[PDB]
C-alpha cells in the first residue's frame, strides 16, 4: 500500500537517495544540461526547481548559504548559483527547467531523459512544436473563432 | 399449463429436489410444493432432463 507516498525508493537508502540526487543536481548546475534515467530526472527536478528559490534569497542570507553548501559538492558552483543562475531567473517565478524524453540507452534499454536549465548557452534541443496555425483544422477553428467573435460584438 | 400439473399420491409433499451450490454448507433440499410455488415450470424441466440421453446433445 503506497497512497500519498511522493518519494521514490532509489539507491541503497534515504542517505544514498539524497546523495544520488545531490550528484545529479551538482552536474546539472555545472554543465547546465545532463542526461540520466527518467525516474531519477523526475525526482531531481523538484530539488533543481527549489535551488533557484534559495538562490534568489541572496548569498548574504545565512539559510541559503548553508543549503547551497550542502547541495553543491563543488564549492566553485556556489558563486555561480548566486551570481549567474539567480540573476537570470529574477523575472521568472517558475518553470526554470524543462524535461524531455530521449531514446532508451543501448546498455540496458532504460528509460532515459534530459533535463536542462532554461536560458543556457548550449545549442537548443529539438523541442516538440505544436501544429502551425496555417493548417486545415486550425484555419477552420480560426474561422469559427472570428464568426463567433463578430456575433457577440454586434 | 405446466402450473396445473398433477402428482399421483403424496408426491407434492414427499418428493424433494436437492441441489448444491458448491460452497460449504450449501446443500439445499426443497419439496415439489416449494419448487412449484417458486418456479411453476421447474418440475417439467427437470423431469425431461433426467430422461434425455446423458451426452453433449442433451443441452
Amino acid at each position: 500500500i503506497s497512497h500519498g507516498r511522493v518519494f521514490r525508493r532509489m539507491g541503497l537508502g534515504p542517505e544514498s537517495r539524497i546523495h544520488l540526487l545531490r550528484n545529479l543536481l551538482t552536474g546539472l548546475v555545472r554543465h547546465e544540461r545532463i542526461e540520466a534515467p527518467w525516474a531519477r530526472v523526475d525526482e531531481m527536478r523538484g530539488y533543481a526547481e527549489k535551488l533557484i528559490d534559495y538562490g534568489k534569497l541572496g548569498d548574504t542570507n545565512e539559510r541559503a548559504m548553508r543549503m547551497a553548501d550542502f547541495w553543491l559538492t563543488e564549492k566553485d558552483l556556489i558563486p555561480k548559483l548566486f551570481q549567474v543562475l539567480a540573476p537570470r531567473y529574477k523575472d521568472q517565478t517558475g518553470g526554470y527547467t524543462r524535461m524531455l524524453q530521449i531514446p532508451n540507452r543501448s546498455l540496458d534499454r532504460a528509460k532515459m531523459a534530459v533535463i536542462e536549465y532554461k536560458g543556457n548557452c548550449l545549442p537548443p534541443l529539438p523541442l516538440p512544436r505544436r501544429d502551425s496555425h496555417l493548417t486545415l483544422l486550425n484555419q477552420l477553428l480560426q474561422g469559427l473563432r472570428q464568426d463567433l467573435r463578430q456575433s457577440q460584438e454586434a | 399449463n405446466t402450473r396445473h400439473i398433477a402428482f399421483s399420491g403424496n408426491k407434492w409433499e414427499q418428493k424433494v429436489y436437492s441441489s448444491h451450490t458448491g460452497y460449504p454448507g450449501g446443500f439445499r433440499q426443497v419439496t415439489a410444493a416449494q419448487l412449484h410455488l417458486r418456479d411453476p415450470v421447474a418440475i417439467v424441466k427437470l423431469a425431461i432432463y433426467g430422461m434425455l440421453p446423458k451426452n453433449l446433445h442433451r443441452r
Binding site: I1, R130, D131, S132, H133, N138, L141, Q142, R145 | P24
Partner: protein, 305 residues
Amino acid sequence: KSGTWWDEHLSEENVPFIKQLVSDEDKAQLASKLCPLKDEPWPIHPWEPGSFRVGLIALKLGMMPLWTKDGQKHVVTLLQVQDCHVLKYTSKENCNGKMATLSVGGKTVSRFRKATSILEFYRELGLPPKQTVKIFNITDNAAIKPGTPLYAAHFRPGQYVDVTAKTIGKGFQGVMKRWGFKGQPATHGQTKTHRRPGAVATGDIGRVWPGTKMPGKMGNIYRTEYGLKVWRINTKHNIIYVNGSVPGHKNCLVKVKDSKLPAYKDLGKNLPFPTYFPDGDEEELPEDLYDENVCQPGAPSITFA
C-alpha cells in the same frame, strides 16, 4: 490507424479558444436547467404509503466533529451534491422488473474523454457528461422528468439514509490483513512461517472448498452502509452531514438514497415528494437546516440541568 486526442492538431492560438468555448457551453447548459417547474414538468403526485422516491449522488469531502445538546460528540461525513441531474426514465414494463427505475448522474467531467455513444446521449439531453451513473428503484408516482436538477435539500435533518460507494482498494494482501488470521509466533523455532495461511482444508476431501479465505486483492468493491441519519444540511453549498463514516476515499462519488431498514420504513410522509423544487417553492430555505438535538455553532454554550 493511429490514436489521437482532442488537442493533437491544435495550434497555440486555438487551444485557449477551444478550452473556454467548451467551458462556456458547459456552464450555459447547466444554467438552462435551473427552472424545472416551468419547462413543462411531469405531474406531481401526493405522497402515499409504500412509495419510493429517487436518491442522490454526492462527493465525499471530509469529516468534522459535531456535538449535541445532550453533550455527546458524533463525527459526520461531508457529502456535497454537485451537478446532480436525472438522465432518463424507464417504466416498469420496459424494465421487466417489479418497480420502475430512474437514472441519475453527477460530477460533470470533460467531454474529450468520453465515448462517442455517451457523448451523443448527453447531446440530446442538453447536459454535460457525468462521471458516474446510478439506477434508483422508484414507483410510478415518483417519476421525474429527465433534465431536472437535484439538490441536497431533497433530504431533511432527522432522516436516515443509505450510502453505497467503492471502498478504498488495497491491492494484493495476505491472510492476516485480508481475513484477520492470527498468524504464527515470531520465535521459538518458527521457520519462514509468520504470516502464512497454514492449513487450507482437510486431507480426506483432496480438494479446496470454493470460497476459501485465501490471499488476494482487497477493496475496490461496492459496499453499502445502512442506518445513517442526517444531522445537518447546508443549503448554499448543497452539503449533507451524514452520521458516522462512509465507504470510499476523499473526493469519491457516493450514491445516497433513503434507508431500507424495516424500522425506518414509512418515514417519508413529511419528506419532499418526489423531490425539492427551489424554483417553485413559496419560501426560501434557511442557510443551514439543523437537527433538534444539534447545538448550533452560534448558540450559547450548553449548560446542563
